[PDB]
Design a protein around this ligand. Structure first.
Ligand code: SF4
Ligand code: SF4
Ligand code: SF3
Ligand code: SF3
Ligand code: FES
Lengths: 629, 629
C-alpha cells in the first residue's frame, strides 16, 4: 500500500481503523483527486470569475488572454488576492469577537475576568488611552479603540502600526504606498479589486496583497492576541501533554476545535464545577475532561496548565478524522476552521456528538448548533457538558470499542516575547550576543498549516525543522506546524540532542528547547514583536536580519496572508507546496527575484528538507556577512 | 474571426476596424476560450481553494468529494458565495464613497452641492434623525447614519430595512434567520465561511447568500442611490442621445467610465469653465465635450440633460473596445468595472489617453493614476482636462483617422419611483387600476449586464425585452442591459408601438415608453421601492405580485448579488447564462424548485427569448389568477 498517510505513528494506526471501517477520509480521498488533477489550476492559469469564462491560458490555441483581456500574471495574482480576502476575513472575525468578549467581560456579562491587568494598562498607555477609573472602564476603552482599528478607513492614521512596527519598515511602507487601512476596509477593497474588469495588473494585485497582510497583523492579529492575554493570561513556558494517547476511554471527553478559544475556556471553567464532575460520575465515567484540538487547543495550552480537567492538545487538522476513530470522543465542539465537512459519518460510526459553536461552521450531520455570543457562553458551555454526559451514556461507553494509540509526547508550550525576555535575564541582549558570536546562526519563524499535497502529514515540516536546528538555527513556531513539532518531540529538552553545537549550547544554558512554541498562525503578529526587537537592538531593518520565515506545508489562506505579511515585512519567506502561481512567469519573477529591491523580502520554494534548510542557511549567512558577523 | 459580435450595427462596424487592425478584443478572444472550455468549471464542480487541491467532482473515477470532504453542492454554492462577496464589496465601496462625498460636500470641500433638499429632509425624518440647524448639518448626520448602517454588526438593529421593506417580507426574513447585519460584517462573515473546512453545507451557504443580498440592498444600495439623488438631483424623464454616433472627432472628447459618477459630474462642471473651453479651442479643437460610458454614464444621464458640453451615453461594457476604435476619444477616465485590462494597446493604436480615477482600477498601459478623494475631485477634474488637451494636441489631432459610425438613437432616461408617481398623477393607484384590468399583465425588473456567453452582445436582452412588452409586461430596466435597450430604441415613444395591445394603450395614454430606464444595477434597491409600493398598495406580499426579475446576459457578481436579493425578496428570478452551479443537483433543486416554499422566489433559466418570456408571463398569470385578476 502506497497511500500517503502521516509521519506520526498514532495517526497511521488510526488511519488503519478508518480504512478497515470503510470510512471516507482525507488520506484516501487524495488519490482519486490525484488521478484527475487539472494542470491549468495547478499553475494558476484558469479563471472562473465571470460568465464569459471559464477561461484558461493556452498560447498554442491563441488563448493568451481571458475573454476580458487579462493575462496569466493578472489571473494568477487576482485569485491569490481573492483567496487571501478569506484569510484576512477569518482573522478580522476573530479579532472583532475578541474585542466584544473583552468589552462584555468588563461589563460583567461573561464567565471570564481581567487576568493580565498589567498588560491592559500598559497597552492602554502605549495607545494613549485614558486609564482613569476602574480597570473595567479601561478595558471598555481599549476594546472600543481596537474595534476602531478594525474599522478605520484608508485615510485615517492608525496607532497600532506606529506602536508595534519599526520605523525603518514604516518608511518603506510609506514609500511603496502600502500603509494599510483597517482590515475591514482593506479586505473590502481587495475583494472589489478582484471583480472582473477592475484590477487586472499583477503588480498592483501583489501590492494589494502586501497591504492586506499588513492590515491583518497590525489591525487584527496583534490586538486580538494581546486581548486574549488580558482575558486569559500571558503565556509562560510549561510542560504539556500532546498526541492522541492523552485520551482515556473511561472519562467523558469533550474536545474543543477551531481557532477562537472562548468556548474552550468556558468549558474548562464549567467542568471544574463539582456539580458537573458529579454528573459525569453518576453516568458511569471516572470524571469529565476537556481536551484542545488544533489552534483553539493551542491557544489554551499556551496559557493554561495540564490538570485533572484540561488534558492537553490532540494535534493539527489532519488529526481530526483519526481522533474520531479513537472511539473516545463524546463531544467535538467546533468554532472555526478546520472543521472538515465529512465528519458526520465518522461521528456516527464512532459514537461522538458534533456541536458547532460558531455561525461560520456548518456541514452535514452536526447534531447541535450553539452559536457563540459572549453573554451566552456560560450557558453554551453548560449545554455542551449536558450533551456530552448524555452522549457518553447513550452512544459510546461500553458500546463503542476504543482504540487509543499509546503515544504521548511532552512539549514545552507557552513561549511568548515576555517568556523569551525572562529566559534571557530581562533583555534581548544575550540573544544578540550569541547570534553575533555565531552560536546561533539565525532564527526562523515557522508559521504553517499541514497538508497532504507535498508529503505525508507533517513530513516536510518535521524534517525541515530537524535540518534547521542541526544548522544552529533557532525556530519560533506557530500554527498547525507548531502542533506537528510538538507531537514530533522537538519542543522539549530532549530535542536539544538534535540541535547543532552552537544551538545545543545556548539551549542547555538557557534551559529551553531548540523549537519555541509561540502558538498559532494568529501569533504571526506576536512573532513580529520578537523580530522587531532584534532589529531595534541591532540598529538595522528587519530585511537585514539573519532570519527567515517558512510555511512548508501550507494549506489555507490564513497561512498565505501571514506569508504576504512576511514579504511586506522584508523577509525571506519559504512556502511549500507551491502556491498556484507557477504558470505566471512575470508574477513568479516579481515574488522570487524582484521583491528584494521593493520590500526586501522574497518567496522561496521547494519541499526537500535539506535543500530548503540549506537555502535558508545561505540567506542567513548572506545577511550575517553584510552585518559583519 | 469572431463567431459572436453584436446586435448593434455601430459596434459591428467598429469591430471590423479592430479586426482589420489585428488588435485583440473580447469578441475575438471568446473563440480560443471556447475551444478549451473546462466542463468541470462550467458546471461548478471544481475547486481551487486550498493546497490539497485543485479538486474536481467525478464520481465515475471515485472522486465523489474534495480532499477535505466537501460535496459538489457545497463546492458550487461556496464558490458562488465567494464570488458574491466581490459583488457586495463593490456596492459597499461605492456607498461608503457616496457618504464621504455627501459629508465633505456639506463641509464645503467639493464642487458639489445639496441639490435635493426635500429628499434630504424626508430621509432624515424617516430615519428619525435630528433635523435641526442648516441643511448641511442634516446632511452630515445622514452621512454618519448611513455609514453606521454599513458598519452595523449582526447584533444591532437596522433602520433602513424597517423603512424601506414591506411588512410580510420582514416577517419572512426574521422567520428564516436572514435579517442581515451591515454589509461590511455580512461580507466578511461570508468570506470567512468560504475558507476551507469552515462552511461546507450548501443550504447554509445559500442562506448566507440570501442574507448577503439583503444586506447589500438595504445596507448599501438604497442609501447610496438616495444620497446620489441628494447630491445631483432625483431623476425625471428627459430625452437623451445614445450610441456611438454621438462622438465628433473635431472636439476634445473626455469619456468617463465605471459605476461611481463623482468624477464625471466634476468633469462636466469643470468643462463649463471658459478657461477650459478656451484652452480646448487654442489647441485646435472646436470645444471640449464630456461623454458617459457604462454605468457611471447612466447615472449621469438619469439626472443631467444633454447640452453643448455633456453629450450622452455611449453604451455598455462590450462597447468600450469599439469606442476606442472610433479614434475620437482623448481621455477615457475609468472609475470601476468594467475597465477591461487590455485597453492599453487599443489606446495606443487609436491615440487615446487612459486615466484611472480609482485605486481599484489598474491594468497595463494606463497613462495616469488620479485616485478619487472628495476634497481633491476639483483638482482631479482639472488635471484630466489638461491631460486631454495635451493628448488631443500631441496624440490624436492630425494623426489618427476617426471612424465614427453614424448611428444615434433617442432614449428617455431618468425614470425613478418619483417620476412614475408623477406620470400617474401623484398616486400609484392608476397603475394598479390598469394591472387589475389586465391592460398591463405585470412588470419585470430587468437588471442585467451583458456578456458573450449566451449570444452576440445584447442579443438575448433586447429580444427578450421585445417579447416581454409584446406580452403586455412593463419593463423597469437597470444595468448594462438598460443601456442595450436604450441603444436598441426600446426606451423612446416610438417603442410604444412595439408593445402589445394593453401596454401600448396605457403607454400611449401616459406618454411613457414601455421600457422605463431606472438606471444601473446599483438601482436594484430603487426598483425594489416600486415593487414594495405595489405590495403595500395591494396589501399583498411581494411573492404574490405579478412581477418577475431577469438578468438575461449576466456577467459579473454585481448582477448575481442582485439576483440573490431578488430571491430573498420572494421573486421569480430569471438568470442567463446559467450560473456555474448546474453540476450540483441538490443545490439546483433548492434554487429552482424548493425556494418557493422558503422565500417565495425561484431561479429560472434559459436563453431563448420566446421561451423565457412565455415562462415569465406564465408566472405572472399564475400570480394574477390567485389575486383574482
Ligand atoms: S474574469 Fe476574464 S479571465 Fe476570468 S472568467 Fe471572466 S473573461 Fe475569463
Ligand atoms: S477546499 Fe476541499 S475541495 Fe477545495 S481545493 Fe481544498 S481540498 Fe479540494
Ligand atoms: Fe492556524 S493553521 Fe492553517 S490548517 Fe486548519 S487549523 Fe491549521
Ligand atoms: Fe452595473 S452592470 Fe454588470 S457588466 Fe460591467 S459595467 Fe455592466
Ligand atoms: S478544473 Fe476547470 S480549468 Fe482547472
Amino acid at each position: 500500500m502506497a497511500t500517503k498517510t502521516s509521519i506520526h505513528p498514532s495517526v497511521n494506526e488510526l488511519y488503519q481503523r478508518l480504512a478497515e471501517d470503510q470510512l471516507s477520509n482525507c488520506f484516501d480521498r487524495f488519490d482519486p483527486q490525484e488521478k484527475i488533477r487539472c494542470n491549468y489550476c495547478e499553475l494558476g492559469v484558469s479563471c472562473q470569475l465571470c460568465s464569459n469564462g471559464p477561461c484558461r491560458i493556452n498560447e498554442k490555441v491563441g488563448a493568451t488572454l481571458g475573454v476580458c483581456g487579462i493575462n496569466a500574471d493578472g489571473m494568477a495574482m487576482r485569485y491569490m488576492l481573492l483567496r487571501n480576502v478569506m484569510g484576512t476575513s477569518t482573522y478580522t472575525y476573530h479579532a472583532y469577537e475578541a474585542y466584544k468578549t473583552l468589552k462584555m467581560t468588563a461589563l460583567g456579562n461573561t464567565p471570564f475576568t481581567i487576568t493580565d491587568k498589567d498588560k491592559l494598562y500598559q497597552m492602554a498607555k502605549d495607545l494613549e488611552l485614558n486609564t482613569e477609573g476602574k480597570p473595567e472602564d479601561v478595558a471598555v476603552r481599549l476594546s472600543d479603540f481596537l474595534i476602531w482599528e478594525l474599522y478605520r478607513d484608508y485615510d485615517e492614521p492608525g496607532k497600532m502600526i506606529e506602536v508595534y512596527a519599526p520605523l525603518k519598515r514604516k518608511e518603506v511602507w510609506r514609500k511603496l504606498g502600502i500603509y494599510p487601512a483597517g482590515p475591514l476596509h482593506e479586505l473590502k477593497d481587495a475583494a472589489a479589486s478582484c471583480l472582473t474588469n477592475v484590477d487586472g495588473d499583477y503588480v498592483s494585485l501583489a501590492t494589494k496583497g502586501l497591504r492586506l497582510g499588513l492590515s491583518c497583523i497590525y489591525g487584527a492579529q496583534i490586538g486580538l492576541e494581546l486581548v486574549q492575554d488580558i482575558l486569559f493570561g500571558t503565556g509562560m513556558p510549561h510542560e504539556m501533554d500532546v498526541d492522541l494517547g492523552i485520551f482515556d476511554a473511561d472519562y467523558i471527553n469533550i474536545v474543543f476545535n477551531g481557532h477562537e478559544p472562548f468556548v474552550g475556556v468556558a468549558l474548562i471553567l464549567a467542568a471544574k464545577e463539582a456539580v458537573n464532575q458529579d454528573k459525569a460520575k453518576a453516568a458511569g465515567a471516572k470524571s469529565l475532561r476537556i481536551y484542545g484540538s488544533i489552534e483553539s487547543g493551542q491557544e489554551v495550552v499556551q496559557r493554561f496548565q495540564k490538570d485533572e480537567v484540561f488534558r492537553g492538545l490532540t494535534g493539527n487538522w489532519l488529526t481530526i478524522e483519526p481522533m474520531l476513530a479513537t472511539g473516545a470522543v463524546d463531544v467535538l465542539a467546533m468554532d472555526m476552521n478546520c472543521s472538515p465537512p465529512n465528519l458526520g459519518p465518522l461521528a456516527e460510526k464512532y459514537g461522538a456528538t458534533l456541536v458547532s459553536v460558531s455561525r461560520l461552521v456548518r456541514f452535514p450531520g452536526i447534531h447541535h448548533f450553539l452559536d457563540y455570543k459572549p453573554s451566552e457562553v456560560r450557558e453554551i458551555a453548560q449545554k455542551i457538558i449536558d450533551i456530552a454526559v448524555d452522549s457518553f451514556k447513550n452512544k459510546r461507553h461500553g458500546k463503542i470499542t476504543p482504540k487509543i494509540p499509546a503515544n504521548i509526547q511532552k512539549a514545552i508550550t507557552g513561549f511568548t516575547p515576555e517568556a523569551i525576555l525572562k529566559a534571557l535575564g530581562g533583555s534581548i541582549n544575550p540573544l544578540i550576543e550569541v547570534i553575533k558570536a555565531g552560536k546561533i546562526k539565525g532564527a526562523v519563524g515557522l508559521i504553517n498549516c499541514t497538508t497532504l499535497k507535498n508529503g505525508p502529514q507533517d513530513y516536510v515540516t518535521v524534517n525541515l525543522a530537524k535540518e534547521l536546528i542541526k544548522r544552529d538555527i533557532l525556530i519560533l513556531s506557530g500554527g498547525c506546524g507548531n502542533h506537528a513539532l510538538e507531537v514530533a518531540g522537538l519542543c522539549n529538552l530532549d530535542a536539544i540532542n538534535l540541535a547543532g553545537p552552537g544551538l545545543s549550547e545556548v539551549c542547555r544554558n538557557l534551559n529551553i528547547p531548540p523549537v519555541l512554541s509561540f502558538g498559532t498562525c494568529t501569533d504571526t503578529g506576536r512573532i513580529s514583536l520578537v523580530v522587531t526587537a532584534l532589529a531595534n537592538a541591532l540598529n538595522v531593518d528587519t530585511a537585514d536580519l539573519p532570519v527567515a520565515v517558512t510555511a512548508p506545508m501550507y494549506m489555507e489562506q490564513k497561512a498565505t496572508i501571514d506569508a504576504l505579511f512576511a514579504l511586506a515585512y522584508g523577509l525571506y519567506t519559504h512556502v511549500a507546496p507551491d502556491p498556484p502561481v507557477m504558470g505566471a512567469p512575470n508574477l513568479v519573477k516579481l515574488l522570487t527575484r524582484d521583491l528584494p529591491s521593493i520590500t526586501g523580502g522574497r518567496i522561496a520554494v521547494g519541499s526537500d528538507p535539506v535543500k530548503v534548510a540549506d537555502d535558508i542557511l545561505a540567506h542567513i549567512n548572506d545577511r550575517r556577512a553584510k552585518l559583519g558577523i
